[PDB]
Amino acid sequence: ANWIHARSTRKKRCPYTKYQTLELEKEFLFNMYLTRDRRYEVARVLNLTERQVKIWFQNRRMKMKKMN
């Protein structure tokens, strides 16, 4: 977890929390896009930054753009 068993860090299956993915999936339904309104409120409940959440979705797309 730190050095005794820490080794693979390029995997990350689903070490996320239910709350985090909750807000992420809630918007994907209707709020397909991210606006200052959502980014702000969702950042207050997810304890993230207005840009942190936006950049999160953006990056996820870029990797799919340039592909592997």
Curated annotation (Swiss-Prot):
It comes from the Eukaryota. Coiled coil: none annotated. Residues 9-68 bind DNA. It is found in: Nucleus. Belongs to the Abd-B homeobox family. Interacts with Geminin/GMNN, which inhibits transcriptional activity. Sequence-specific transcription factor which is part of a developmental regulatory system that provides cells with specific positional identities on the anterior-posterior axis. This is Homeobox protein Hox-C9. It comes from Homo sapiens. The gene is HOXC9.
